[PDB]
Ligand binder design. Structure first.
Ligand SMILES: Nc1ncnc2c1ncn2[C@@H]1O[C@H](COP(=O)(O)OP(=O)(O)O)[C@@H](O)[C@H]1O
Ligand SMILES: [Mg+2]
Ligand SMILES: [Mg+2]
Lengths: 68, 57, 201, 68
């Protein structure tokens, strides 16, 4: 801990795009539950938000050249 | 009086009845100025000048 | 014609029309008229009861009498439910008897999704149409298509298109454009680049 | 005439009924053939939700990204 591995990712995002917020950040700490993977690839077929699709998938599709 | 004030000599009617003319509104001067969007407007012009689908969204 | 959007099913129909004009490969189709039907045009102006029915019926009778008309219905999935009402009959149920007896020769054009959701649900309408899969052309095929279309786009944009430009367009659109299909995205890349260089000067 | 249709996601299903034809199906031939110059405005979510379901209509429009 304290050693700057996240800061390295922010520095790379800044160098490649000009701002840290251009990085697509997905904190794995909210994916502890098995069904939390729905936030990445969307709701399972037949569920409520199935047609919305995954959040990470849409963010990557919008910006195909990014840091994840 | 109306006739004296009027014109003694008295092409898309449907669209005029339905839509608003942004060009005459810009001529009037009620649209706010747009600042610093040269690249996006240029891209819109480029898409509008295409032969095949020229519909920018 | 079944294929993903942008492959060229409408281009297939127009190529059939051009082949008819120049020289049709068989005799039986030497003198034929290919007419494109739009369901919006048919439904329009039928505010009174049954006018859609009489209009489509007259169309079918004229097809039967003429005998040299091949009807091309683009967006075939729109045929179901068209002109319907609380107790009226859609265009599909009108066309089914004529297709079954054999007075109509239709050329449909729809993607796999719309065909499967709309046409496959009805067995009577499905048993009269034969799917013709239109596949995405290869890279060399797309280059040939772009070279064939080069004249029209050069005329429109008043620029010169080089072969290296065609190769780059097809390769880059294949590698970096994922949501669309080869001919459409290559054509779009060529068209946008031409418009850009024309606007710059 | 250049046509501007703000809230382009309303194009799909507009005027649909039990036996009517909606605006998108009517306008598809004109949009494909370069006959009508239509400028559309919509949000990313509305684009994805409404005018990406109709893949043919999505094909007929060229998205221009307006960044913050
Ligand atoms: N062999 C070809 N020659 C010329 N143009 C083609 C060819 N194949 C495809 N195209 C282009 O692809 C487009 C046809 O797309 P299409 O699949 O008909 O769209 P939709 O599925 O929405 O009807 C046309 O604009 C045409 O310019
Ligand atoms: Mg960390
Ligand atoms: Mg078509």
């Amino acid at each position: 801990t304290g050693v700057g591995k996240t800061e390295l990712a922010r520095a790379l995002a800044e160098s490649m795009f000009g701002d840290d917020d251009a990085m697509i950040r997905v904190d794995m700490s909210e994916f502890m539950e098995k069904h939390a993977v729905s936030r990445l690839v969307g709701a399972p077929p037949g569920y409520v938000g199935h047609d919305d699709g995954g959040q990470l998938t849409e963010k990557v599709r919008r910006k195909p050249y990014s840091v994840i | 009086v109306v006739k004296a004030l009027g014109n003694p000599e008295m092409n898309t009617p449907t669209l005029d009845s339905l839509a608003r003319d942004l060009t005459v509104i810009a001529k009037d001067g009620t649209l706010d100025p747009v600042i610093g969007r040269d690249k996006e407007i240029t891209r819109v012009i480029e898409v509008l000048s295409r032969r095949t689908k020229n519909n920018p969204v | 014609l079944i294929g993903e959007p942008g492959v060229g099913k409408t281009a297939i129909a127009e190529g059939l029309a051009q082949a008819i004009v120049n020289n049709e490969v068989p005799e039986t189709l030497k003198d034929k008229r290919v007419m494109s039907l739009d369901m919006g045009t048919v439904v329009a102006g039928t505010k009174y009861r049954g006018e859609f029915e009489e209009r489509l019926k007259k169309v079918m009778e004229e097809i039967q009498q003429a005998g040299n008309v091949i009807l091309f219905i683009d967006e075939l999935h729109t045929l179901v439910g068209a002109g319907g009402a609380e107790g009226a009959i859609d265009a599909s149920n009108i066309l089914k008897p004529a297709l079954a007896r054999g007075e109509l020769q239709c050329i449909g054009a729809t993607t796999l999704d719309e065909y499967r959701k709309n046409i496959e649900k009805d067995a009577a309408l499905e048993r009269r149409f034969q799917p013709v899969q239109v596949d995405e052309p290869s890279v060399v095929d797309t280059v040939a298509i772009l070279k064939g279309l080069r004249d029209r786009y050069e005329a429109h944009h008043r620029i010169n298109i080089s072969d290296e430009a065609i190769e780059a367009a097809v390769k880059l659109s294949n590698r970096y454009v994922s949501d669309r299909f080869l001919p459409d995205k290559a054509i779009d890349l060529i068209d946008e680049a031409s418009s850009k260089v024309r606007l710059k000067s």
